Structures are given as C-alpha cells and as structure tokens.
GROMACS .gro file of C-alpha atoms in nm:
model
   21
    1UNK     CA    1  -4.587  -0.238  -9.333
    2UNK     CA    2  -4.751  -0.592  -9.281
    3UNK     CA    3  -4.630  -0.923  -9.053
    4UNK     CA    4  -4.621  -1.269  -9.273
    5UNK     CA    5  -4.458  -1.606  -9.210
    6UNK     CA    6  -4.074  -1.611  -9.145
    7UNK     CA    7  -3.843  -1.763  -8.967
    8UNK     CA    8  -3.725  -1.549  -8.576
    9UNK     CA    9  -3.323  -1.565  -8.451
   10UNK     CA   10  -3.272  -1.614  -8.104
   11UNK     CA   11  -2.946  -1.681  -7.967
   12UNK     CA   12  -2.786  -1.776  -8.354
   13UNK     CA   13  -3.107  -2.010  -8.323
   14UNK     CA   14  -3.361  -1.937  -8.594
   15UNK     CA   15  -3.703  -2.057  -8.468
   16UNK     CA   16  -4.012  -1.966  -8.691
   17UNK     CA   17  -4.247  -1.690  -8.604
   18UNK     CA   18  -4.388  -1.410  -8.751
   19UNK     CA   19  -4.170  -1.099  -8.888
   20UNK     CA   20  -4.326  -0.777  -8.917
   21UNK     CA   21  -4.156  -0.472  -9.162
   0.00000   0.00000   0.00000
C-alpha cells in the first residue's frame, strides 16, 4: 500500500487529492 496523486469524488464532484490503496 502507498498514497500518490489522484483525483477525490465528493458529491459526483471529483476534486484532486491524494488516494491511498
């Protein structure tokens, strides 16, 4: 497991973040 750039989803509104998996 490791966190790298992405793109987050809040309310059907992607906003980008950090996703970790």
């Amino acid at each position: 497991r490791w966190c790298v750039y992405a793109y987050v989803r809040v309310r059907g509104v992607l906003v980008r973040y950090r996703r970790c998996w």
